[PDB]
């Protein structure tokens, strides 16, 4: 199963913390979200807003994604996010991440109707 | 047999069902569960009555200073013949460290201990070393990363070292000890009877000055297989100061980690005399370092000296551009020993990818892994990768995550994967966007040839 909308809910949502607790946040999340299962996911971002405050970006500003496709709506509000980024000492199975918290606009892709988001594109 | 709740917030019923099993399990790994002091009480009790347990791992749990004290007391029974114990991120402060001495005394079975990510402070390390000394303590692998250990912690460790001959692995990474402390430590290591196999010191604050001291250890520790020195501004000088010991005929270092260490072209020149000299050096990271295309040109020359038998090379983010691919590729065609290549996060662009594709597509190539992660490859670049996938027989993995690839790109990759003679096994495409139409063809190709994984 796992609808691409679910893959998204799993891979990039954290409505509970409003900001990353420590510099040791990512190392856990990447683990408890199976991003370091087969190999270490190179990078991943988590958004700290409520889901509906995120599913609403699909009827917002329409922008072209990094790959030139047109279904990427960018949000107006600077949302509380977190950039997880593999460290130089990340030789899978041994995975390691550098946590950086930040508030930025988040562009995401939307697909279908219900026009839900299905891939995190970038922050600005 | 092996308990393993991991990332499950344990229900009070599952904990109680579990309880009597704790006295039967050989291995327990209660990593990141709802564990607290409460659970620790039962763990402790159950710990003192289990005659077979050999590894306890109470990772990422707010066990705390109180809860750890009790869990510890569980291991404090004759019955307890544990050999590996981890309490990574267990919120243990230099306060709960009070029982470490009494504890290491009774466990001459313990061989592995992980205390990382715990704010032991130097006060915690101190008490930790009072146990490490007793002739009834014989630890082999010690890990103390992210412990808020300043340089004060170095003398008592230098001390633990001059007295031990057991330790095979030491990892103190991510503790601001500086140049002075590491010298106090480098000194102690020198006057030590042990034969280490692994030594790790990341973001520890060394300077070129400390390499001079390392030069000895490396040159003399014949049991040293991995030397992880990343995130330390040693720069070119330190490197230079470091080689005399690496050439040491008694050094068989297999893995040398040197990422984000301030090395530029100059330092590779010093390193290349090693690759040419050392048939024992196998893995080697240089990610982060601004080697540039010339740093590249350089390394290539020694991967051609057939006496160089290096297998895994990582240059993630090393300021390379298309201009190195002409060299990178030439090496690739003639080199019979290199199997893995991390070229990620380097602006190679479509043009760079292609020379690789042509080089690699020649007969007899050997590279099994090529990670072109984040190298500015577009839909038009998957077209070279496509022809590549058809003609090359050697490649087992191709990472291409984080590029400007879309539907037409994948589709061109699939054209080649869906064919019959394709030898690839994993195509790594994390963070790439494609639609249902494609995802179907994917879940579909992932149907025809199931022994080929396409990860994302």
Curated annotation (Swiss-Prot), chain A:
Family of this protein: Belongs to the pancreatic ribonuclease family.
Binding positions for substrate per the UniProt entry: 7, 10, 41-45, 66, 85
Catalytic reaction list: an [RNA] containing cytidine + H2O = an [RNA]-3'-cytidine-3'-phosphate + a 5'-hydroxy-ribonucleotide-3'-[RNA]; an [RNA] containing uridine + H2O = an [RNA]-3'-uridine-3'-phosphate + a 5'-hydroxy-ribonucleotide-3'-[RNA]
Protein name per its UniProtKB record: Ribonuclease pancreatic
Active site (record annotation): 12 (proton acceptor), 119 (proton donor)
Chief place of localization: secreted
Quaternary structure (record): Interacts with and forms tight 1:1 complexes with RNH1. Dimerization of two such complexes may occur. Interaction with RNH1 inhibits this protein. Monomer.
Location in or out of the cell: Secreted
EC number: 4.6.1.18
Function according to Swiss-Prot or TrEMBL: Endonuclease that catalyzes the cleavage of RNA on the 3' side of pyrimidine nucleotides. Acts on single-stranded and double-stranded RNA.
Domain of life of the source: Eukaryota
Listed result of changing residue 119 to A: Loss of activity
Enzyme class, first EC level, given as a word: lyase
GO biological process per UniProt: defense response to Gram-positive bacterium
A GO cellular component annotation in the UniProt record: extracellular region
UniProtKB/Swiss-Prot annotation, chain B:
Example GO molecular function: ribonuclease inhibitor activity
Localization terms from the record: Cytoplasm; Nucleus
Superkingdom of the source species: Eukaryota
Keywords in alphabetical order: Acetylation, Cytoplasm, Leucine-rich repeat, Nucleus, Phosphoprotein, Repeat
SUPFAM superfamilies the UniProt entry points to: RNI-like
GO cellular component: angiogenin-PRI complex; cytoplasm; lamellipodium; nucleoplasm; nucleus; plasma membrane
GO biological process: cell migration; regulation of angiogenesis; regulation of Arp2/3 complex-mediated actin nucleation
Chief location category: cytoplasm
Domain remark from Swiss-Prot or TrEMBL: The LRR domain forms a horseshoe-shaped structure that interacts tightly with target RNases via a large protein interaction surface on its interior side.
Function field: Ribonuclease inhibitor which inhibits RNASE1, RNASE2 and angiogenin (ANG). May play a role in redox homeostasis. Required to inhibit the cytotoxic tRNA ribonuclease activity of ANG in the cytoplasm in absence of stress. Relocates to the nucleus in response to stress, relieving inhibition of ANG in the cytoplasm, and inhibiting the angiogenic activity of ANG in the nucleus.
Protein name: Ribonuclease inhibitor
């Amino acid at each position: 199963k796992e609808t691409a909308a679910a893959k998204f809910e799993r891979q990039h949502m954290d409505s509970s913390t409003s900001a990353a607790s420590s510099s040791n946040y990512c190392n856990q999340m990447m683990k408890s979200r199976n991003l370091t299962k087969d190999r270490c996911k190179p990078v991943n971002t988590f958004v700290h807003e409520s889901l509906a405050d995120v599913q609403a970006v699909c009827s917002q500003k329409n922008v072209a994604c990094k790959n030139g496709q047109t279904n990427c709506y960018q949000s107006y509000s600077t949302m509380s996010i977190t950039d997880c980024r593999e460290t130089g000492s990340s030789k899978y199975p041994n995975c390691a991440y550098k946590t950086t918290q930040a508030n930025k606009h988040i562009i995401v892709a939307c697909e279908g109707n219900p026009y839900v988001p299905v891939h995190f594109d970038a922050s600005v | 047999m092996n308990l393993d709740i991991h990332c499950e917030q344990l229900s009070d019923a599952r904990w109680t069902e579990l309880l009597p099993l704790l006295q039967q399990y050989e291995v327990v790994r209660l990593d990141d569960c709802g564990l607290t002091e409460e659970h620790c009480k039962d763990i402790g009790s159950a710990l003192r009555a289990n005659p077979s347990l050999t590894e306890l791992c109470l990772r990422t749990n707010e066990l705390g200073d109180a809860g750890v004290h009790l869990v510890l007391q569980g291991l404090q029974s004759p019955t307890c013949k544990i050999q590996k114990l981890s309490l990574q991120n267990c919120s243990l402060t230099e306060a709960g460290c009070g029982v470490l001495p009494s504890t290491l005394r009774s466990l001459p079975t313990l061989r592995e201990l992980h205390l990382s990510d715990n704010p032991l402070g130097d006060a915690g390390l101190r008490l930790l070393c009072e146990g490490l000394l007793d002739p009834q303590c014989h630890l082999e692998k010690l890990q103390l990363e992210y412990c808020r250990l300043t340089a004060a912690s170095c003398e008592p460790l230098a001390s633990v070292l001059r007295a031990t001959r057991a330790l095979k692995e030491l990892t103190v990474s991510n503790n601001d000890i500086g140049e002075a402390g590491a010298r106090v430590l480098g000194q102690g290591l020198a006057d030590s009877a042990c034969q280490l196999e692994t030594l790790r010191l990341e973001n520890c604050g060394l300077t070129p000055a400390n390499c001079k001291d390392l030069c000895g250890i490396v040159a003399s520790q014949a049991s040293l297989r991995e030397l992880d020195l990343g995130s330390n501004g040693l720069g070119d000088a330190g490197i230079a100061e470091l080689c005399p010991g690496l050439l040491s005929p008694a050094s068989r270092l297999k893995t040398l980690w040197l990422w984000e260490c301030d090395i530029t072209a100059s330092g590779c020149r010093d390193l290349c005399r090693v690759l040419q000299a050392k048939e024992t050096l196998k893995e080697l990271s240089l990610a982060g370092n601004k080697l540039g295309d010339e740093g590249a040109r350089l390394l290539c020359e020694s991967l051609l000296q057939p006496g160089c038998q290096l297998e895994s090379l990582w240059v993630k983010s090393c300021s390379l551009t298309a201009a190195c691919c002409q060299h990178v590729s030439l090496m690739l065609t003639q080199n019979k020993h290199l199997l893995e290549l991390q070229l990620s996060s380097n602006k190679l662009g479509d043009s760079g990818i292609q020379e690789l594709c042509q080089a690699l597509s020649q007969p007899g190539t050997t590279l099994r892994v090529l990670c072109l992660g984040d190298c500015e490859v577009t839909n038009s670049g998957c077209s070279s990768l496509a022809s590549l996938l058809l003609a090359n027989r050697s490649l087992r993995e191709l990472d291409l995550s984080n590029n400007c690839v879309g539907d037409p790109g994948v589709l061109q990759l699939l054209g080649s994967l869906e064919q019959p003679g394709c030898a690839l096994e994993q195509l790594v495409l994390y963070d790439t966007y494609w639609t249902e139409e494609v995802e179907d063809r994917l879940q579909a190709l992932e149907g025809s040839k199931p022994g080929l994984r396409v990860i994302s």
